[PDB]
Amino acid sequence: SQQYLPLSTACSSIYFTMESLKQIHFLYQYSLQFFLDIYHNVLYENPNLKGVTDHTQRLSIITKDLFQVAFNRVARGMLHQDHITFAMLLARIKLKGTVGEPTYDAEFQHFLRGNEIVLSAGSTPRIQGLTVEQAEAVVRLSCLPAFKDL
């Protein structure tokens, strides 16, 4: 159960991402039954699983096709400009799921809510070859511990 748990966490995160997808656009309405159809299409009638016997490799194949099929079903029912948004959401879900990488909470926090940093007037020097918008963004992004020397 502990070995197979990350796949279940990925499934739950995927489903609730689709459920909350309705906020981006009124059209993106998805039900639990649709996600269960996706899940069963991943688990059964999956051509990639044919000829595979090892359990860990079967896990990897199942989770990879789970992400791929979820994207192929949901994005096809979505506008073009939101395909990349849903791909990012799936990528973040996998990054949380995977083991071996840092959670990178600070990087995504600055990627999303990075514009909510107060910059006092005169605290942004006009760097050579940089516009005021570019310099101001540079100053905001320099707040990161790995970006202080930028």
UniProtKB/Swiss-Prot annotation:
Localization of this protein: Cytoplasm, Cytoskeleton
Family to which the UniProt record says this protein belongs: Belongs to the dynein heavy chain family.
Known function: Cytoplasmic dynein 1 acts as a motor for the intracellular retrograde motility of vesicles and organelles along microtubules. Dynein has ATPase activity; the force-producing power stroke is thought to occur on release of ADP. Plays a role in mitotic spindle assembly and metaphase plate congression.
Assembly information from the UniProt record: Homodimer. The cytoplasmic dynein 1 complex consists of two catalytic heavy chains (HCs) and a number of non-catalytic subunits presented by intermediate chains (ICs), light intermediate chains (LICs) and light chains (LCs); the composition seems to vary in respect to the IC, LIC and LC composition. The heavy chain homodimer serves as a scaffold for the probable homodimeric assembly of the respective non-catalytic subunits. The ICs and LICs bind directly to the HC dimer and dynein LCs assemble on the IC dimer. Interacts with DYNC1LI1; DYNC1LI1 and DYNC1LI2 bind mutually exclusive to DYNC1H1.
Domain writeup: Dynein heavy chains probably consist of an N-terminal stem (which binds cargo and interacts with other dynein components), and the head or motor domain. The motor contains six tandemly-linked AAA domains in the head, which form a ring. A stalk-like structure (formed by two of the coiled coil domains) protrudes between AAA 4 and AAA 5 and terminates in a microtubule-binding site. A seventh domain may also contribute to this ring; it is not clear whether the N-terminus or the C-terminus forms this extra domain.
Disease: Charcot-Marie-Tooth disease, axonal, type 2O: An axonal form of Charcot-Marie-Tooth disease, a disorder of the peripheral nervous system, characterized by progressive weakness and atrophy, initially of the peroneal muscles and later of the distal muscles of the arms. Charcot-Marie-Tooth disease is classified in two main groups on the basis of electrophysiologic properties and histopathology: primary peripheral demyelinating neuropathies (designated CMT1 when they are dominantly inherited) and primary peripheral axonal neuropathies (CMT2). Cortical dysplasia, complex, with other brain malformations 13: An autosomal dominant disorder characterized by global developmental delay with impaired intellectual development. Some patients show signs of peripheral neuropathy, such as abnormal gait and hyporeflexia. CDCBM13 is associated with variable neuronal migration defects resulting in cortical malformations.
Protein name: Cytoplasmic dynein 1 heavy chain 1
Species per Swiss-Prot/TrEMBL record: Homo sapiens
Gene that this polypeptide is encoded by: DYNC1H1
